[PDB]
Amino acid sequence: GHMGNAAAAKKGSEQESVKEFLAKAKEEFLKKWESPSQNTAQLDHFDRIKTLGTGSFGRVMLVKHKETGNHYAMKILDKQKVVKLKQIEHTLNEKRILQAVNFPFLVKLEFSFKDNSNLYMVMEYVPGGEMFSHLRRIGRFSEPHARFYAAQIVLTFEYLHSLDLIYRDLKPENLLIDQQGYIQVTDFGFAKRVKGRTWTLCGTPEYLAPEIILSKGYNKAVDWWALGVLIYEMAAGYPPFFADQPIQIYEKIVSGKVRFPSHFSSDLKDLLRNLLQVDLTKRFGNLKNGVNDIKNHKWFATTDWIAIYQRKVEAPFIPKFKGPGDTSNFDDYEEEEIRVSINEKCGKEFTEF
Amino acid sequence: TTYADFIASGRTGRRNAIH
Numbered sequence: 001g002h003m004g005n006a007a008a009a010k011k012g013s014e015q016e017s018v019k020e021f022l023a024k025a026k027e028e029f030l031k032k033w034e035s036p037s038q039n040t041a042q043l044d045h046f047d048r049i050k051t052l053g054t055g056s057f058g059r060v061m062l063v064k065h066k067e068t069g070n071h072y073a074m075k076i077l078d079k080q081k082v083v084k085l086k087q088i089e090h091t092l093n094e095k096r097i098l099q100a101v102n103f104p105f106l107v108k109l110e111f112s113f114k115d116n117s118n119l120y121m122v123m124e125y126v127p128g129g130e131m132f133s134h135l136r137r138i139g140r141f142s143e144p145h146a147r148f149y150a151a152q153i154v155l156t157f158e159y160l161h162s163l164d165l166i167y168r169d170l171k172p173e174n175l176l177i178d179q180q181g182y183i184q185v186t187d188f189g190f191a192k193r194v195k196g197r198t199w200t201l202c203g204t205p206e207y208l209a210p211e212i213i214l215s216k217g218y219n220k221a222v223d224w225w226a227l228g229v230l231i232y233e234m235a236a237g238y239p240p241f242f243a244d245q246p247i248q249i250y251e252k253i254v255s256g257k258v259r260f261p262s263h264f265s266s267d268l269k270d271l272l273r274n275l276l277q278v279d280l281t282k283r284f285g286n287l288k289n290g291v292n293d294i295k296n297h298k299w300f301a302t303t304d305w306i307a308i309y310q311r312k313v314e315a316p317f318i319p320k321f322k323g324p325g326d327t328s329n330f331d332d333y334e335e336e337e338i339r340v341s342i343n344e345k346c347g348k349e350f351t352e353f
Numbered sequence: 354t355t356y357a358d359f360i361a362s363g364r365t366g367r368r369n370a371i372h
């Protein structure tokens with residue numbers, strides 16, 4: 001067979017230790033899921049510095065905690081705008097997820113609070129900028145570089161899916177590079193905790209699995225399709241399906257004919273054909289062997305999964321850091337005033353935040 | 354080429370989600 005006795009025992013043991021880890025992680029998650037934190041700071045505790053970008057349904061500002069000098073990334077959500085967009089439940093759910101999960105590649109929620117006008121999610125500041133920026137700057141990542149990032153997403157999805165969470169917005173724009181060169185996943189505004197099938201048309205066009213586009217329902221395997229899109233985009237510099245307009249992108253996705261740059265390794269092409277697989281009885285991450293079909297694939301043969309989790313692998317790119325609160329790794333954005341009305345808006349709808 | 358088509362697509366910048 002492919003493994004002798006020692007290698008087979010080692011792999012078997014590693015796979016059993018994942019099960020043990022995930023059982024404990026679920027216990028810890030459910031305690032926080034059932035009793036969320038609330039109202040752990042207020043706005044005048046922070047200096048507002050600069051807008052870092054957007055997140056689902058809001059804008060993200062670099063802030064400095066006045067008492068400590070620590071910097072954070074604060075997402076500001078206008079309650080009235082959220083109501084108009086029909087996104088009350090998704091904003092509540094994002095905060096509930098962020099305060100309940102705990103994983104080294106998931107951005108942490110350090111404080112949250114609300115006022116008459118807005119909701120505030122004060123996250124860790126991840127200073128190295130978006131993966132999107134670095135990818136567009138250098139064109140494409142080498143396969144080892146892409147693999148280092150991909151391994152972090154594989155472990156993060158293994159974790160989230162064990163909690164019955166589907167992420168549903170993987171893309172380089174949402175992945176931030178920290179000071180050690182590791183990835184932080186942001187934006188849970190489209191995530192859902194559900195145990196089987198769901199139907200919502202949501203996500204980013206290039207990253208949608210065919211079964212999201214089509215009226216049929218879908219499950220967590222859409223995240224493994226999206227991983228295929230991400231790995232392809234990281235290694236090629238462009239995604240496998242694109243067009244001028246989303247309608248035409250969707251046609252290409254459900255047609256599903258993937259073509260590869262000639263510099264892609266055979267191992268990479270094999271992995272991607274098994275992730276970008278329209279047939280759910282064949283898509284990796286959706287089979288009897290679960291995530292192990294991905295983690296044990298030849299393209300990941302050099303990946304030390306525990307060492308990635310422990311953040312002991314040397315990252316391929318370390319962002320430059322000028323000083324505290326430096327935003328040199330970010331685009332500039334329009335600076336929008338934070339206004340707080342004298343009257344409480346939408347109080348009953350956002351009670352749980 | 355595929356890369357040239359990507360540049361011509363207008364979707365090389367940040368991509369918004371839909372809901």
Ligand SMILES: NCCNS(=O)(=O)c1cccc2cnccc12
Nearest residue numbers: 052053054060073125126173186
């Ligand atoms: N474009 C999606 C990412 N937006 S963002 O403003 O970069 C951003 C969003 C969420 C958390 C962040 C933490 N640190 C830095 C930036 C953060």
